[PDB]
């Protein structure tokens, strides 16, 4: 009855008059001296956490006239192993602080023994099962899950308590991630991806698209990030297939990649080996443990903090032939325990879409320039390199690169986003997008204004905890702020 016989009688205005004047949205002007650099966390240096080595990886290669996924992985691994002479008795150089390093040594020895056993069999199976030795039981987290009981049967246990749900420990930014990105943004001398076929071009637009696609494929196939994409896709595909198929035994999975060298000769390269544990995965976040042992030429003693989770062995010496002559260098093996979930593996098999991202941003960049010249500028864009964009930093000042360099940089950024996924990255990107937009508005002198800038800064900073990738992104944002307001 009250509502039916209700008429508007200055209610809102009276209530607004009654309300205190402290309830207001005061606009804070955003000037060039207003923004401040992001506060990065302090603590021990961050350590490598990728599922495989990226810039320190080493591969044993053999010329094989086979396309991707054609040959038997075990035979390719055996042949690549044969190609190398100069093995040595393993010995521990940099041990895993919290682990049982002798178990890692015995794991490598058992891998070699099983390789020899299959070698002297004259029949290569598609998959090889590894014996459930004590070292592999420990390294793969065998029987580490606490027993599940009813609460009434353990309510009196003295130390029974809720799971640990504290904030992740913080870690400061380490310079090795920038070096990783620089290496991932470089040009390679060998093609890494061979795309499939499509229908014949019938329309002129299809011909223009094919020419531009040839240019883009040439630019992208010779990028280290593409090698990382292919390696990650293969590793995740093999891990998921093994986990679903044989979820009760330890399987030996070689890390293989197929490439084409600048002379046109196909090569199969072996990076290392992966041994998966029991993989009774039920939830999408259920973890399957594996032990990864990867070859490398990098001495861990130069950056020990980068290899906190790794145990490094000396497995041989290699006689590398250089331009001037031959030089002998030690050959190290990085052995560690890692884990992956169904969701992580699934998103690891779709790393190829990363390409699209960069490519799209590149194409729209060319077309926007071609729209105002009425001619396709792609060939003019990156055959004369007339147009350059600021894409780097140097001691002298900002560095500019061609559209090809920009494409490679965006591809590397997408790849690292895929390989370092975490809620921290999501939150930081989402929160820093607003600050980027505010800075852009300031650059367009659109009189930007903020209601609570310190709150936005706190929200951005709360997402920087221990991830090297997000810390590097924050450092990049700080550099951009420094250069975007001078």
């Amino acid at each position: 009855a009250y509502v039916d016989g209700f008429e508007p009688n200055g209610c809102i205005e009276g209530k607004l008059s009654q309300m205190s004047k402290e309830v207001n949205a005061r606009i804070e002007p955003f000037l060039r001296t207003t923004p401040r650099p992001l506060r990065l966390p302090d603590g021990p240096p961050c350590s490598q956490r990728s599922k495989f080595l990226l810039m320190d990886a080493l591969k044993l290669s053999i010329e094989d006239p086979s396309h991707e996924g054609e040959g038997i992985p075990l035979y390719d691994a055996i042949k690549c192993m044969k190609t190398f002479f100069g093995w040595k008795e393993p010995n521990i150089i940099k041990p895993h602080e919290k682990g049982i390093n002798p178990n890692y040594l015995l794991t490598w020895k058992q891998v070699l023994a099983e390789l020899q056993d299959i070698k002297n069999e004259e029949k290569i199976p598609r998959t090889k099962n590894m014996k459930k030795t004590s070292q592999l039981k420990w390294a793969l987290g065998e029987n580490m899950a606490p027993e599940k009981v009813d609460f009434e049967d353990c309510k009196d246990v003295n130390d029974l308590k809720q799971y640990d749900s504290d904030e992740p420990e913080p870690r400061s930014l380490a310079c090795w991630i920038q070096s990783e990105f620089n290496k991932a943004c470089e040009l390679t001398d060998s093609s890494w991806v061979e795309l499939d076929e499509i229908g014949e071009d019938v329309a002129p637009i299809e011909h223009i698209a094919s020419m531009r696609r040839n240019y883009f494929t040439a630019e992208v196939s010779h990028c280290r990030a593409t090698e990382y994409i292919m390696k990650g896709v293969y590793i995740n595909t093999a891990l998921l297939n093994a986990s679903c198929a044989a979820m009760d035994d330890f399987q030996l999975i070689p890390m293989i990649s197929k490439c084409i060298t600048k002379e046109g000769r196909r090569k199969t390269n072996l990076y290392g080996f992966i041994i998966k544990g029991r993989s009774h995965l039920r939830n999408d976040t259920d973890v399957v443990n594996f032990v990864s042992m990867e070859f490398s030429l990098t001495d861990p003693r130069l950056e020990p903090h980068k290899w906190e989770k790794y145990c490094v062995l000396e497995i041989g010496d290699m006689l590398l032939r250089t331009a001037v002559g031959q030089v002998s260098r030690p050959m190290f093996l990085y052995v560690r325990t890692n884990g992956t979930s169904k969701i992580k593996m699934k998103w690891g098999m779709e790393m190829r879409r990363c390409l699209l991202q960069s490519l799209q941003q590149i194409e729209s960049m060319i077309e926007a320039e071609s729209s105002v010249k009425e001619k396709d500028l792609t060939k003019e864009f990156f055959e004369n390199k007339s147009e350059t964009w600021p894409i780097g930093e140097s001691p002298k000042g900002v560095e500019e690169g061609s559209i090809g360099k920009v494409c490679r940089t965006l591809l590397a950024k997408s790849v690292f986003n895929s390989l370092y996924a975490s809620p921290q990255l999501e939150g930081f990107s989402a929160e820093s997008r607003k600050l980027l937009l505010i800075v852009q508005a300031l650059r367009d002198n659109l009189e930007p204004g903020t209601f609570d800038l310190e709150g936005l800064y706190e929200a951005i900073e709360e997402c920087l905890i221990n991830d090297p990738w997000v810390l590097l992104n924050a450092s990049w944002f700080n550099s951009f702020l420094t250069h975007a307001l001078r």
Binding site: F84, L320, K405
Partner: peptide, 24 residues
Amino acid sequence: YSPTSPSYSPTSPSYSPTSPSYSP
């Protein structure tokens, strides 16, 4: 089309530590 980079140095990156030549 052969991609190239001005930062590509022909002498500084010796023996390609990632993918070297070791065949005897």
